[PDB]
Curated annotation (Swiss-Prot), chains A, B, C, D:
<dbReference type="GO" id="GO:0006826">
    <property type="term" value="P:iron ion transport"/>
</dbReference>
<dbReference type="InterPro" id="IPR009078">
    <property type="entry name" value="Ferritin-like_SF"/>
</dbReference>
<feature type="binding site">
    <location>
        <position position="58"/>
    </location>
    <ligand>
        <name>Fe cation 2</name>
    </ligand>
</feature>
<comment type="function">
    <text>Stores iron in a soluble, non-toxic, readily available form. Important for iron homeostasis. Has ferroxidase activity. Iron is taken up in the ferrous form and deposited as ferric hydroxides after oxidation.</text>
</comment>
<keyword id="KW-0408">Iron</keyword>
<feature type="binding site">
    <location>
        <position position="61"/>
    </location>
    <ligand>
        <name>Fe cation 1</name>
    </ligand>
</feature>
<dbReference type="GO" id="GO:0005737">
    <property type="term" value="C:cytoplasm"/>
</dbReference>
<keyword id="KW-0479">Metal-binding</keyword>
<dbReference type="InterPro" id="IPR008331">
    <property type="entry name" value="Ferritin_DPS_dom"/>
</dbReference>
<dbReference type="InterPro" id="IPR014034">
    <property type="entry name" value="Ferritin_CS"/>
</dbReference>
<feature type="binding site">
    <location>
        <position position="103"/>
    </location>
    <ligand>
        <name>Fe cation 2</name>
    </ligand>
</feature>
<feature type="binding site">
    <location>
        <position position="23"/>
    </location>
    <ligand>
        <name>Fe cation 1</name>
    </ligand>
</feature>
<comment type="subunit">
    <text>Oligomer of 24 subunits. The functional molecule is roughly spherical and contains a central cavity into which the polymeric mineral iron core is deposited.</text>
</comment>
<dbReference type="InterPro" id="IPR012347">
    <property type="entry name" value="Ferritin-like"/>
</dbReference>
<comment type="similarity">
    <text>Belongs to the ferritin family.</text>
</comment>
<keyword id="KW-0560">Oxidoreductase</keyword>
<dbReference type="InterPro" id="IPR009040">
    <property type="entry name" value="Ferritin-like_diiron"/>
</dbReference>
Length: 172, 172, 172, 172
């Protein structure tokens, strides 16, 4: 019943709230990875800062969904932000593998929201996802995949010298 | 039979001409609102200038449809620009309510043209509407809705002090 | 057993993790207030931006506790970030009253952590709280109290003109 | 009997002189590490310069205690600066392990002086230690711990290539 609401299905409104939550969950997982790589017994500061920056990006993505919801006349409904799946992330390779799976989980949720928007004939929501989320996700998945290939080439997890070299030449 | 024409359905060509006319109609309605708020017995100059700027925006939107029509090899066909529904617009709240309904009428026509372009499998016309019209319409509807909420909060239509305050702090 | 750990009690390590969580909870509550004041049927954008900025400040406070934990050789342990107490915040006065109580809840948790650090004879943790958190909390509580006094003076919750005036002259 | 003396216990005056001596001892140990890494048969110049800079920092810390003593009306009493525990420091890992233990010895002496100042109700001396010494010590211990983690990852002491890489990418 919002005065601005036009062509905005209840199902899309709810799916935007769920997508908002998933972006916040992804942010929190990257915060955990930042804190792990900043541990004195891990101490890979460029890796830590890579994940801290990703945490900020995902929070920005969540805030853009809040703004979107209000622009369309939907109502932001928040739920708990679940803690990350792990308390410790092993090493740079294990963390990047977890980041790749997280990025693909977020991408699948964005693609599913695009399919719902398509089914409800919502071109504005389709354009928003295509213009503000789907290309960044493909770029992020490619970047992380490239890093995993390099970490395997550098002999992770066993090769500690390879892990050091990655921190000093791939994320400086 | 234009040498440039490719994947451009006659129905979409005609609907672009009708959409062009509606943009010119919207421009003319905003011109009327400008002239009303510039009356000596209305005298809300920042409100008048808000509507004058919207009149120019809608004329620009119409000219972009003329250029689009020619780029695709369609032919611009003009019809009369109907005078606005009212000769006088009451007060800032009544005018903003009329502007919200006008913006939603224009938005519905753009969404209907997007559905026709989708049915005729015209991705260029879909992209044009998504990239050049649909996001501006959502932003404009949100802005006007926000203003209506504030005018009601300020006690319009009865509260003349509230109307003055809006002119001096919301559209300066 | 961290190689850096010195004079850092397990109880203080755990209380820092709980304090981290409370800062994230406070951030999330301010995010909710931002989204509420950005609604088309609320539409107090300077109030919304005040709360959005507070949301960012509290996230920064949480990240500083993560860095602190690692500097001392403690281990960051994350828990769920609980959703805010309300889904809607009434009006500027109700939201500022909720913000004052939230700031005093955070302040009481910081004072309780300072008392634990005092009992465990941890001057570094005491100094950190005194230098990085306790003075900002007193300033924030004073600012919000001052705003509540002004909102009451302006006739909130009933006086919508007063609410408009506050948005346009106290948080611009 | 100094005209400036107020709330300055004899025990704190003596403990400041002992703390002064320990800072000079720490400076001298870092001087020894500088000279070791500058040897032609060691030749890790960035490591050498790291330790030379730490030697200067500790001398500055000692001079600040001399100034403090005089500000409070105590009297500087100097003792011999004992030569460092070792004449040669093995390799970058052995030296960093010795530096970590030295930093924790200095930190424990600062914490013990803070406890004495607390027992004698000397808030000025407490503030001085908290503001000028205790946070730098936590930062220094964290930095050295992080370096030790990286040197172990790089295969020290056996992996000479790892030692070279550290000199060229961690302390450049
Ligand atoms: Cl709708
Ligand atoms: Cl529709
Ligand atoms: Cl619906
Ligand atoms: Cl929902
Ligand atoms: Cl659950
Ligand atoms: Cl785990
Ligand atoms: Cl995942
Ligand atoms: Cl969905
Ligand atoms: Cl054609
Ligand atoms: Cl085709
Ligand atoms: Cl055709
Ligand atoms: Cl036509
Ligand atoms: Cl007619
Ligand atoms: Cl009329
Ligand atoms: Cl209309
Ligand atoms: Cl149509
Ligand atoms: Cl300890
Ligand atoms: Cl101690
Ligand atoms: Cl303990
Ligand atoms: Cl814990
Ligand atoms: Cl619970
Ligand atoms: Cl509620
Ligand atoms: Cl609270
Ligand atoms: Cl506590
Ligand atoms: Cl005295
Ligand atoms: Cl005294
Ligand atoms: Cl005495
Ligand atoms: Cl002495
Ligand atoms: Cl002796
Ligand atoms: Cl020796
Ligand atoms: Cl030592
Ligand atoms: Cl002492
Ligand atoms: Cl290299
Ligand atoms: Fe994202
Ligand atoms: Fe991403
Ligand atoms: Fe990204
Ligand atoms: Fe338009
Ligand atoms: Fe597009
Ligand atoms: Fe418009
Ligand atoms: Fe516009
Ligand atoms: Fe004013
Ligand atoms: Fe905070
Ligand atoms: Fe104190
Ligand atoms: Fe605060
Ligand atoms: Fe603040
Ligand atoms: Fe020192
Ligand atoms: Fe130090
Ligand atoms: Fe230092
Ligand atoms: Mg309504
Ligand atoms: Mg619904
Ligand atoms: Mg979910
Ligand atoms: Mg759980
Ligand atoms: Mg793009
Ligand atoms: Mg690349
Ligand atoms: Mg021809
Ligand atoms: Mg035709
Ligand atoms: Mg028409
Ligand atoms: Mg007629
Ligand atoms: Mg766009
Ligand atoms: Mg706005
Ligand atoms: Mg260890
Ligand atoms: Mg413990
Ligand atoms: Mg808690
Ligand atoms: Mg719950
Ligand atoms: Mg005490
Ligand atoms: Mg201060
Ligand atoms: Mg003030
Ligand atoms: Mg004398
Ligand atoms: Mg004496
Ligand atoms: Mg001594
Ligand atoms: Mg001797
Ligand atoms: Mg300090
Ligand atoms: Mg560091």
């Amino acid at each position: 019943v919002s005065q601005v609401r036009q062509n905005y299905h209840s199902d899309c409104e709810a799916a935007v709230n769920r997508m908002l939550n998933l972006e916040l969950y992804a942010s929190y997982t990257y915060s955990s990875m930042y804190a792990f790589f900043d541990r004195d017994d891990v101490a890979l500061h460029n890796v830590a800062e890579f994940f801290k920056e990703n945490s900020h990006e995902e929070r920005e993505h969540a805030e853009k969904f809040m703004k979107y919801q209000n622009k369309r006349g939907g109502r932001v409904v928040l739920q708990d932000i679940k803690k990350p799946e792990r308390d410790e992330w092993g090493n740079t390779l294990e963390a990047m593998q977890a980041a790749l799976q997280l990025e693909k989980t977020v991408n699948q949720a964005l693609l599913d929201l695009h399919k719902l928007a398509t089914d409800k004939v919502d071109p504005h929501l389709c354009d928003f996802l295509e213009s503000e989320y789907l290309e960044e996700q493909v770029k992020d998945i490619k970047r992380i995949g490239d890093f995993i290939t390099n970490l395997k080439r550098l002999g992770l997890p066993e090769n500690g010298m390879g892990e050091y070299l990655f921190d000093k030449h791939s994320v400086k």
